[PDB]
C-alpha cells in the first residue's frame, strides 16, 4: 500500500545512535580495543593510575589487558553465567632498599561486558545500567535563606570523592568554613595556605566591610605550622596533634588527588565561574614541603564581590541543566572499580608487613577478592543496575535512555521535594517533559530527549542550527544549557524560503523565555520538534492535540505492549518507527550488497559482493525477561537481491521493519449498552477469529535435586502411589516430554525426597500395612504446574553434576528447567490502549452479528465510549481515527509528524477521495440511498451537521468529511439515530492480562512467626485485610465478620482448624479463640522484661497459653 508523508520541516540531521549513551560510555571506560600505550587516562585506565603506586617495598602498575570471554552471550544466559572478560594487570614489585625488581602479570578477576545493544548479562539475566543525574561538581553560590542580603559559597566534588565546603559570612562579620558538620573561622585555613595579612589585606581590601571580618590578629601570630596544628585539634578532638599526623589528615582532606577528587567537569566549572585555572582536581596542593593554595582564594574573592553587588556576579540555579550532569554507565562502573581497587591496596600493605619481608612477588601480594566483590556488588545489588525491560523492543530502548536522580549518590524518595521533580526550562531539548512515572517517582526518573547526547563532561547537549544574517545554515551545534542561554533561538517551524528565513517576525527563546524577534536577531534555530521529547513521546501522532497528562500515559504504555503474532504498524505513524526497530537490534539487516542464498525458519544465508557466504541464525521463540516471545521471522526469499541496510528478518513487534506494537482496528466511537461504562471496551469476536491481539508467552519452571542428610533427591519417573495416567507424558527420566499439553496439577519433573526421621506416622505404618504395600523410603516432591498456568512444553534443559562443562552450587546434584509456551487469545479482562492514553479493559466480546456495522455489511471491531474523550482532553486519538478512515478505503498509511502534521484541510481532502470509493461503488452497482440513511440524515440536519436542501449523496459526504458515517445496529437492523464516528485506530494489548492476575485461596501456606497466611499469588497467598479494611468492617458495625478476619481466617490456629472441620462436616463455624499473633506480642513484651497479664473481671490472671508456658 501507499505511504503518504506530511510535514514541511526538512530535518538537517538524523536522530543520533539511540543507545550511544550506553554503548559509547562503556567502550570509553574499558578501551579494550585500544593498544595500551595509546589509552587516555579515563575509565579503567584512570582508576589504575589513582590506586598506584602502593607504597607502605613499592608495587607499581604497568598496563592491563582484557581477555576474550570464556563463553558467548547465548551460552551465558543458558547456564546462569555472567558475560564478562578476564582482566589481567602487569605489576612490578620494587624493594626500595635493595633495588630488586620482580614482575608478573596478576589476574584480578573478571569484568562484565556490554552487549551490542547496550545491555548486560549478570548471572544469566539481562540487565541495564541506568544513567544517573546529580549535582555537577564545581563551585556554586546560593542565597542564604535566613539572611536575605547574604550568600553561601559551596565547593562540591564528585560523590564520595571529598567533603562539601560552605563559606558563610556570619552576622558577627567573620567568614566561616563548614566541613564535616564542624564550623570555624575561615581565616585559620587562609594562614595555613601560607597567606599573610599583606597578601590578603591588599587582595580583598576593595570590599570595605568584608575584609575586616576576615582579619584575626591571633591567627597571624602563628606560622603555617602552628596554624595547621591548631586547626587539626578543632576538627578531631582527642587525637594527639602530632605534626606528621595533622599534615596527614588535612592533606587527605584537601590536596590528596587520591582522597579528594573534583571532577574534570568540576575543574571546568570552577575555572569558568571564578576565572582561574586549576592545576588539578584538588582544592590545594602539597608542594615544596608546604601547602600552596588553588581554589579557596578565588572562591572567597567571588563571594565578597557578589554580596557587595559587584557587576558580573550571579547566583547559581542548582536545577539548571548546566549545573546538573549525567553519570553514564562507564562512570558509574568505574567508581565501583576504584573502590575495589583501594581495598586491594589495603590488602597489599598488610601483606607487606607479615610473612617474609624479602620473598614476595606481586602474585603473592595481591588478593583480587576485594576487587571482584566490588564489581559483583555493583552489577548484582546496585540500585542503578535494573532487570532489563524487554517486553517489546521499545521496552529495552526506552530503559537504556532513562535518567534516574535516585541511587547511590543521589536523593531518596522521602528526601526529594518539588524543585527536583519540576520541569526546568533548561530541560528543553535535553530531557523529555512528558515521559516520567506517574506516582511516587514522578520527576525523579526521566528520559533522554531524542536528539540529545551526553558529552564527555556529562552535560546533556541538544542540537541547534546556525543562523548567520537571515540564512539558516546546515551546520548543527550541540550545545550545553549554559552555552544555549547566550543566544536567541528561533522555533523550528519558523517559515522558510530556501535557506532564508521567510517570516518578518519569528518566535524565539532567550534563556527559555519566549520572545518575538526580527530575522536579524536569530542566532540559531531548533533542528526539529522531535528534539523536545523522548522516543516514546515521539511515537504519538497528533501529540500537539493531546493534554500532557494523557500523552504521558501514551508514552509509558507503549512500553508495555505485548508482541503479537500478527503485529502491525500503525496506519498513522510519526516517521520514527523505522529507526526504533533498527537501533533496537531486534531486526536483522544486510551488511553489504548481495544475493540471498538460503531462507529458512531457523536461518538466512547471504552471498555478498566479497564472494563470502555469511550465515545469520535467527532467534526463534526465545523467552524474554517478561515472558513475551522474542522471535525473528525471515522477510526475504531465496535469490532476492538485497542492498546494504535492507531488511532481512522481522524482529518481534515489527512489521516489514516498522515498529508494530499493536493492531489497526476498525473502531466506532459511541456508547454501547453500558459495556463501555467508565473506560471499559467492547470488542468483536471477529478479532479472535482472525487472531488479532494474540500473543505467545513462555513461562520457565525450574527444579533442583540436592544431597541431603537423609539421602539424595532423585529425578525419576518412579513416584510413589502415582497412576500411569499421571505419569503418561513423562519420559524415561521423569521429565515431561516435549510437546505435551500440561495443565494445573500436572507433573513437570518427577522427583523423590527421602522421608524425614519422624518418617511415616505409626498411623500411616498400620494403614499401609492393611493394604500390603509396605511403606516407602521416599516421598513425592515432583515439580507441578501451578494453578492457572500451563501450555505446551517447548524445551527442557537438564544439568547434572559430572557431565562436561557443568558444575552447580554445593550440594545440588542436578537442575532441570522446563519452558512452557502459550498462545493467548484476547479475553475479557485484558487491557488495551492507544498511543494517546486511552486505556481500558475488555468487558464484553460480541458475536459479529451484534456489532454495529456499516451499510455495506462491514462490522466494526472495537466500540470505545465517547465519554472518555472530553474530560481527558486527548483529541489526537480523534484525528487519528479520521485519517484512519480515509486510509481504510484508499488503502494507505500515513506519516504525520508531531507538531508538523496533517492538518484539517488535508485530512478533509483525503476523506473526500475516500467517500468516492465508499459510495460511488454502490451507486454503480445498482443501489441507491437507503431508507434508514435518509432517516439519519433527517436527524443529522436537525443537528446542523448537513446543509438542508442537498441531495442525500451530498449530505452523506458532508458527514463523511466530519469522519461520521451511518451505522446500523446489528441487533435491530435500525440505524443509530445519529451519525457516528468510525475509523481505523492503532490499539495495543498491554502486558496486564487477567490470566496473570486472577487469584483465589481457601487455605494455604502460613508464616513462621505470625502464623498468618503468606502474601502474593506465587506463594498461594491470602489478601491483606489491612488497617483501613478493618475500619470499613468497623464502620459497618460488622463485628462477627471482622472477628473472623482476625481469627478463623488468619492466625487463630485452633479456630481455623475447627472452622475448616465444621464446614466439611456441614456444621456452623465455631466461636474463635486467641489469635496467635497476640501470643507472639505477649512473649515479645516478656523478652523486653515487661509483664503483660490478661485478667478477668475479678482481676485474676487468665492464662492464654493454657498451662503450656508455666512450670
Amino acid at each position: 500500500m501507499e505511504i503518504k508523508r506530511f510535514g514541511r520541516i526538512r530535518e538537517v540531521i538524523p536522530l543520533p545512535p539511540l543507545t550511544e549513551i550506553q554503548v559509547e560510555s562503556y567502550r570509553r571506560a574499558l578501551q579494550a580495543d585500544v593498544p595500551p600505550e595509546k589509552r587516555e587516562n579515563v575509565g579503567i585506565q584512570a582508576a589504575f593510575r589513582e590506586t598506584f603506586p602502593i607504597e607502605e617495598l613499592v608495587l607499581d602498575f604497568l598496563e592491563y589487558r582484557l581477555g576474550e570471554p570464556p563463553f558467548p552471550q547465548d551460552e551465558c544466559r543458558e547456564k546462569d553465567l555472567t558475560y564478562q572478560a578476564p582482566l589481567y594487570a602487569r605489576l612490578q614489585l620494587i624493594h626500595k632498599d635493595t633495588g630488586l625488581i620482580k614482575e608478573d602479570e596478576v589476574f584480578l578477576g573478571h569484568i562484565p561486558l556490554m552487549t551490542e545493544d547496550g545491555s548486560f548479562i549478570i548471572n544469566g539475566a539481562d540487565r541495564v545500567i541506568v544513567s544517573q543525574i546529580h549535582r555537577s561538581p564545581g563551585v556554586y553560590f546560593t542565597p542564604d535563606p535566613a539572611r536575605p542580603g547574604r550568600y553561601i559559597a559551596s565547593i562540591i566534588p564528585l560523590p564520595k570523592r571529598g567533603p562539601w565546603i560552605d563559606l558563610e559570612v556570619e552576622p558577627n562579620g567573620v567568614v566561616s568554613m563548614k566541613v564535616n558538620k564542624r564550623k570555624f573561622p575561615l581565616v585559620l585555613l587562609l594562614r595555613v595556605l601560607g597567606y599573610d595579612q599583606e597578601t590578603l589585606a591588599r587582595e580583598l581590601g576593595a570590599y570595605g566591610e568584608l575584609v575586616q571580618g576576615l582579619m584575626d590578629e591571633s591567627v597571624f601570630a602563628m606560622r603555617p605550622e602552628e596554624a595547621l596544628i591548631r586547626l587539626f585539634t578543632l576538627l578531631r578532638p582527642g587525637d594527639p596533634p602530632k605534626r606528621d599526623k595533622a599534615v596527614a589528615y588535612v592533606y587527605g582532606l584537601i590536596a590528596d588527588p587520591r582522597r579528594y577528587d573534583l571532577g574534570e567537569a568540576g575543574r571546568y566549572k570552577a575555572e569558568e565561574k571564578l576565572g582561574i585555572r586549576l592545576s588539578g582536581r584538588t582544592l590545594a596542593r602539597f608542594e615544596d614541603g608546604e601547602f600552596k593554595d588553588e581554589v579557596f582564594l578565588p572562591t572567597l574573592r567571588y563571594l565578597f564581590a557578589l554580596t557587595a553587588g559587584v557587576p558580573g556576579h550571579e547566583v547559581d540555579d542548582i536545577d539548571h541543566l548546566g549545573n546538573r550532569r549525567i553519570r553514564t554507565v562507564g562512570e558509574l562502573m568505574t567508581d565501583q572499580f576504584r573502590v575495589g581497587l583501594a581495598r586491594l591496596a589495603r590488602g597489599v600493605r598488610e601483606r607487606m608487613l607479615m610473612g617474609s619481608e624479602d620473598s614476595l612477588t606481586p602474585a603473592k601480594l595481591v588478593n583480587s577478592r576485594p576487587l571482584e566483590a566490588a564489581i559483583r556488588e555493583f552489577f548484582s545489588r546496585s540500585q542503578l543496575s535494573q532487570f532489563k525491560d524487554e517486553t517489546n523492543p521499545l521496552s529495552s530502548l526506552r530503559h537504556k535512555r532513562r535518567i534516574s536522580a535516585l541511587g547511590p549518590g543521589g536523593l531518596t524518595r522521602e528526601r526529594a521535594g518539588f524543585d527536583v521533580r519540576d520541569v526546568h526550562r533548561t530541560h528543553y531539548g535535553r530531557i523529555c517533559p512528558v515521559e516520567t512515572p506517574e506516582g511516587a517517582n514522578i520527576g525523579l526518573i526521566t528520559s533522554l530527549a531524542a536528539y540529545a547526547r551526553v558529552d564527555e563532561l556529562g552535560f546533556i547537549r541538544t542540537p541547534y542550527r546556525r543562523v548567520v544574517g537571515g540564512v539558516v545554515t546546515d551546520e548543527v551545534v550541540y550545545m550545553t544549557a549554559t552555552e544555549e542561554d547566550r543566544y536567541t533561538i528561533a522555533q523550528a517551524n519558523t517559515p522558510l524560503e530556501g535557506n532564508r528565513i521567510a517570516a518578518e517576525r519569528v518566535v524565539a527563546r532567550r534563556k527559555g523565555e519566549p520572545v518575538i524577534v526580527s530575522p536579524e536577531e536569530v542566532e540559531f534555530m531548533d533542528v526539529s520538534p522531535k528534539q523536545v521529547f523522548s522516543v516514546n513521546t515521539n511515537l504519538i501522532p497528533f501529540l500537539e492535540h493531546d493534554d500532557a497528562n494523557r500523552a504521558l500515559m501514551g508514552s509509558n504504555m507503549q512500553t508495555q505492549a505485548v508482541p503479537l503474532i500478527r503485529a502491525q504498524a500503525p496506519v498513522v505513524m510519526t516517521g520514527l518507527e523505522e529507526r526504533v526497530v533498527r537501533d533496537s537490534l531486534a531486526a536483522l539487516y544486510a551488511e553489504e550488497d548481495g544475493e540471498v542464498a538460503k531462507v529458512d525458519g531457523n536461518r538466512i544465508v547471504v552471498r555478498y559482493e566479497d564472494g563470502r557466504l555469511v550465515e545469520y541464525p535467527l532467534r526463534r521463540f526465545y523467552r524474554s525477561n517478561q515472558g513475551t516471545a522474542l522471535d525473528q521471522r525471515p522477510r526475504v526469499v531465496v535469490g532476492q537481491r538485497v542492498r546494504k541496510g535492507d531488511l532481512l528478518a522481522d524482529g518481534p513487534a515489527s512489521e516489514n521493519g516498522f515498529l508494530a506494537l499493536g493492531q489497526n482496528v476498525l473502531v466506532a466511537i459511541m456508547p454501547f449498552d453500558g459495556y463501555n461504562f467508565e473506560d471499559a471496551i467492547v470488542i468483536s469476536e471477529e478479532l479472535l477469529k482472525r487472531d488479532f491481539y494474540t500473543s505467545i508467552h513462555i513461562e520457565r519452571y525450574e527444579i533442583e535435586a540436592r544431597d541431603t542428610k537423609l539421602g539424595p533427591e532423585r529425578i525419576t519417573r518412579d513416584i510413589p502411589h502415582l497412576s500411569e495416567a499421571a505419569l503418561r507424558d513423562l519420559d524415561e527420566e521423569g521429565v515431561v516430554r516435549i510437546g505435551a499439553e500440561v495443565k494445573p496439577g500436572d507433573i513437570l519433573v518427577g522427583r523423590t525426597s527421602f522421608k524425614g526421621e519422624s518418617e511415616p506416622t505409626p498411623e500411616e505404618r498400620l494403614l499401609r500395612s492393611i493394604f500390603g504395600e509396605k511403606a516407602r523410603d521416599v516421598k513425592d516432591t515432583s515439580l507441578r504446574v501451578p494453578p492457572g498456568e500451563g501450555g505446551i512444553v517447548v524445551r527442557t534443559v537438564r544439568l547434572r553434576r559430572g557431565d562436561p562443562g557443568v558444575e552447580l552450587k554445593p550440594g545440588v546434584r542436578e537442575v532441570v528447567r522446563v519452558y512452557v509456551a502459550q498462545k493467548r487469545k484476547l479475553q475479557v479482562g485484558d487491557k488495551l490502549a492507544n498511543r494517546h492514553g486511552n486505556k481500558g479493559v475488555v468487558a464484553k466480546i460480541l458475536p459479529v452479528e451484534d456489532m454495529p456495522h456499516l451499510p455495506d455489511g462491514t462490522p466494526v471491531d472495537v466500540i470505545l465510549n465517547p465519554l472518555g474523550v472530553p474530560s481527558r482532553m486527548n483529541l489526537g486519538q480523534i484525528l487519528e481515527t479520521h485519517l484512519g478512515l480515509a486510509g481504510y478505503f484508499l488503502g494507505q498509511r500515513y506519516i504525520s509528524p508531531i507538531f508538523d502534521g496533517a492538518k484539517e484541510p488535508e485530512i478533509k481532502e483525503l476523506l473526500a477521495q475516500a467517500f468516492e470509493v465508499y459510495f460511488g461503488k454502490r451507486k454503480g452497482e445498482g443501489f441507491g440511498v437507503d431508507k434508514r440513511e435518509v432517516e439519519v440524515l433527517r436527524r443529522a440536519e436537525k443537528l446542523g451537521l448537513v446543509t438542508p436542501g442537498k441531495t442525500p449523496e451530498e449530505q452523506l459526504k458532508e458527514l463523511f468529511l466530519q469522519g461520521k458515517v451511518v451505522l446500523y445496529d446489528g441487533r435491530t437492523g435500525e440505524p443509530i439515530e445519529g451519525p457516528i464516528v468510525v475509523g481505523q485506530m492503532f490499539i495495543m494489548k498491554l502486558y496486564h492480562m487477567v490470566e496473570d492476575k486472577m487469584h483465589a485461596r481457601s487455605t494455604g501456606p502460613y508464616s513462621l512467626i505470625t502464623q498468618q497466611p503468606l502474601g502474593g499469588k506465587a506463594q498461594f497467598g491470602g489478601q491483606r485485610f489491612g488497617e483501613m479494611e478493618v475500619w470499613a468492617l468497623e464502620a459497618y458495625g460488622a463485628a462477627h465478620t471482622l472477628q473472623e478476619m482476625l481469627t478463623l481466617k488468619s492466625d487463630d490456629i485452633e479456630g481455623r482448624n475447627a472452622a475448616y472441620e465444621a464446614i466439611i462436616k456441614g456444621e456452623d463455624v465455631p466461636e474463635p479463640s486467641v489469635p496467635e499473633s497476640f501470643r507472639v506480642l505477649v512473649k515479645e513484651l516478656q523478652a523486653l522484661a515487661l509483664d503483660v497479664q490478661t485478667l478477668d473481671e475479678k482481676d485474676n490472671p487468665v492464662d492464654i497459653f493454657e498451662g503450656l508456658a508455666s512450670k
Partner: protein, 84 residues
C-alpha cells in the same frame, strides 16, 4: 494445615473404629508392632515376652489380625481414601 489437621484426625478415628472390632489381645499386638503404642516398632521376640507367648505365635495373630482387619475394610470401604 487445616486440611492436614482434619485429615490426620479423621484417620486416627477410623483406625480405632477398626481396632476395637479385633479382640483386645490381637489388637494390642498390632499396635505394639507398628509403634502406635510407645512410638517404636517392637520385634517379634519382645511382643512374645509381654504376652508371654512364642515368637511364632505372635506372628500368627498379627497375620490373622491383619487378615480380619482386611476383611472389615473390603466391607466398609472406610480406610481406602486415606491412601492418597
Amino acid at each position: 494445615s487445616p486440611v492436614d489437621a482434619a485429615t490426620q484426625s479423621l484417620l486416627s478415628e477410623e483406625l480405632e473404629k477398626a481396632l476395637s472390632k479385633l479382640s483386645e489381645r490381637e489388637a494390642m499386638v498390632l499396635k505394639l508392632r507398628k509403634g502406635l503404642i510407645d512410638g517404636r516398632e517392637h520385634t517379634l521376640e519382645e511382643v512374645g515376652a509381654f504376652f508371654g507367648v512364642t515368637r511364632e505365635r505372635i506372628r500368627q495373630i498379627e497375620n490373622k489380625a491383619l487378615r480380619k482387619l482386611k476383611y472389615h475394610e473390603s466391607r466398609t470401604r472406610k480406610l481406602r481414601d486415606f491412601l492418597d
